[PDB]
Design a protein around this ligand. Structure first.
Ligand SMILES: [Mg+2]
Ligand SMILES: [Mg+2]
Ligand SMILES: [Mg+2]
Ligand SMILES: [Mg+2]
Ligand SMILES: [Mg+2]
Ligand SMILES: [Mg+2]
Ligand SMILES: [Mg+2]
Ligand SMILES: [Mg+2]
Ligand SMILES: [Mg+2]
Ligand SMILES: [Mg+2]
Ligand SMILES: [Mg+2]
Ligand SMILES: [Mg+2]
Ligand SMILES: [Zn+2]
Lengths: 177, 83, 116, 66
RNA sequence: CCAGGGCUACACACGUGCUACAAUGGCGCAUACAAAGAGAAGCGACCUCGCGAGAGCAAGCGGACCUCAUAAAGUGCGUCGUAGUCCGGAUUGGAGUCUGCAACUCGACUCCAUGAAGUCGGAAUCGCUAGUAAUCGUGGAUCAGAAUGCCACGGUGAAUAC
């Protein structure tokens, strides 16, 4: 957790100024960063579900939790209980070491990288963005791949409104636009 | 395209028409049969209704129409489809 | 063996494997290596690590992968919204360069549509 | 964390074209080479010059002079 | 009589062609071998620039004298080693040159970026008996410009006919 010490010493005192907080507990922080692969093509065979979890475990070094269908719908042709995705919940020491490689190594490797949106914080601080390529990480070999996946990022935080979460991540010099 | 040591091509009459238009200061639709003349930057901001073989259809010249020609905005055939 | 924001192949030669960049051909890649100072028949693998560094400083001055896909999409959409003759042919799927469309217009229109 | 199920994880050291010799913790196993650190990539001076919308009149008067 | 437009349109149907789907080939480099033609408002050496089509200055010839003019396939050496590829070249983006009052509709050509279909084609059908077929170049007439067409020329050169 390199960037966590950078949060504690300099990002807190910055945010105390521009929002006039009257308690050290009132400043925003981040709770968790969640990485979802919605792999719908596992209903054809379990072979593609198994190699998608070998990707995202190599990216973020925890074991992925396979998700299941909440309700059984016919427009997508799934029952109630079919495995339809995976996820990893990152917290604490392991959270910032994804967020270190994220805004330094992994994100500027995107083909035709222009920058990210900022109207994308759903009212209550929580940023969620999606990535179009699992190749961008320095983990997976470019030649050893077989099938292209895709995932997203969800940065849950303790910001009260839409504005405080934009100013939180901006003091981590986040590459908006 | 026309050569560059020759320079641009324009009719001598439409050059006198646009000059007389800007010097007088009108927004009257100038009707001219010069589809073969290249638009000059004094023609920007005027309505110049260039003929298409059948009638006169108006063109209000914006910025991005400088190196083009007037015939490109006056379509000379007509086509909706076969069925 | 990684040049210009894409991956360039390993076991192909010098001037050939650079043509994987959207923006160079056989001629412009000879301009890369004759300026930099590398022989042309070595592969992109077994180029040294002081060789891949400077080779992008030859590449960066060209308008390439993302910088070149946007200005073509800016060029064609600029022809769309003026109302020129060219952009009418870009929004109607009928070719632009004067060619006969009575017969042999099978690229811009796609292959043959049967009558229904 | 459970001592059996997880993949390995260890400090590696990442080298970029910007002269960075940077230290992370990653599941690669070997070392790492980069091309774009977030200190060099055209993100604060690149998006400015790459647009270049260009003066339409200066397309016309660079070609010639009357 | 005149200016612009049309004869160049395109859900589509048939006839005749050129280029292809590659190694008996592509590219690069060196290097051998023709015949028939035209030319005065014509063809336009060398030199000088230009990535190049060209431009500049400007000899030479009414022509077995001079120019158009460099034949290509081939051979020597070298590489790429079966992939939609160092095969194929369509198609579009930005620049150009030229002839021409004038290149938007609606010209040819150059340079650079893009790099489709196509991996030998169902039934059916055509040409050809020897310097033929196959192959690869080259000239000419119409013509300001604009040949995969038409007419003419040589190089290589088969299989087979009970
Ligand atoms: Mg390329
Ligand atoms: Mg008339
Ligand atoms: Mg006709
Ligand atoms: Mg048919
Ligand atoms: Mg080729
Ligand atoms: Mg060969
Ligand atoms: Mg020269
Ligand atoms: Mg194909
Ligand atoms: Mg080419
Ligand atoms: Mg094959
Ligand atoms: Mg002739
Ligand atoms: Mg002619
Ligand atoms: Zn780099």
């Amino acid at each position: 957790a390199k960037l966590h010490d950078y949060y504690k010493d300099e990002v807190v005192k910055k945010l105390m100024t521009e929002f006039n907080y009257n308690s050290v507990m009132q400043v925003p922080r981040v709770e968790k960063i969640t990485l979802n692969m919605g792999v719908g093509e596992a209903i054809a065979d379990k072979k593609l579900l198994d190699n998608a979890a070998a990707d995202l475990a190599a990216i973020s070094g925890q074991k992925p939790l396979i998700t299941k269908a909440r309700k059984s719908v016919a427009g997508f042709k799934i029952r109630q209980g079919y495995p339809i995705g995976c996820k990893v919940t990152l917290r604490g020491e392991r959270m910032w070491e994804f967020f270190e490689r994220l805004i330094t190594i992994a994100v500027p490797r995107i083909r035709d990288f222009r920058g990210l949106s900022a109207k994308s914080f759903d009212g209550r601080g929580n940023y969620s963005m999606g990535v179009r390529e699992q190749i961008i990480f320095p983990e997976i070999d470019y030649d050893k791949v077989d099938r292209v996946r895709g995932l997203d990022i969800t940065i849950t935080t303790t910001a009260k409104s839409d504005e405080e979460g934009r100013a939180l991540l901006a003091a981590f010099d986040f590459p908006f636009r | 395209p026309r050569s560059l040591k020759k320079g641009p091509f324009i009719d001598l009459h439409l050059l006198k028409k646009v000059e007389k238009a800007v010097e007088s200061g009108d927004k009257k639709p100038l009707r001219t049969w010069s589809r073969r003349s290249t638009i000059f930057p004094n023609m920007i901001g005027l309505t110049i209704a260039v003929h298409n073989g059948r009638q006169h259809v108006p063109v209000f010249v914006t910025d991005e129409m400088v190196g083009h020609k007037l015939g490109e905005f006056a379509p000379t055939r007509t086509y909706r489809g076969h069925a | 063996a990684r040049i210009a924001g894409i991956n360039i192949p390993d076991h192909k030669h010098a001037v050939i494997a650079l043509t994987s960049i959207y923006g160079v051909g056989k001629t412009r890649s000879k301009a890369i290596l004759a300026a930099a100072g590398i022989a042309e028949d070595v592969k992109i693998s077994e180029l040294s690590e002081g060789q891949i560094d400077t080779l992008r400083d030859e590449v960066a001055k060209f308008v390439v992968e993302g910088d070149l896909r946007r200005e073509i999409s800016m060029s064609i959409k600029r022809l769309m919204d003026l109302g020129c003759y060219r952009g009418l042919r870009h929004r109607r799927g009928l070719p632009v360069r004067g060619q006969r469309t009575k017969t042999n217009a099978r690229t811009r229109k796609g292959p043959r549509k049967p009558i229904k | 964390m459970k001592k059996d199920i997880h993949p390995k994880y260890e400090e590696i050291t990442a080298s970029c074209s910007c002269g960075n010799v940077m230290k992370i913790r990653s599941t690669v196993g070997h070392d790492l080479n980069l091309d774009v650190c977030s200190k060099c990539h055209p993100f604060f001076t690149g998006k400015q010059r790459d647009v270049a919308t260009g003066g339409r009149v200066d397309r016309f008067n660079k070609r010639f002079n009357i």
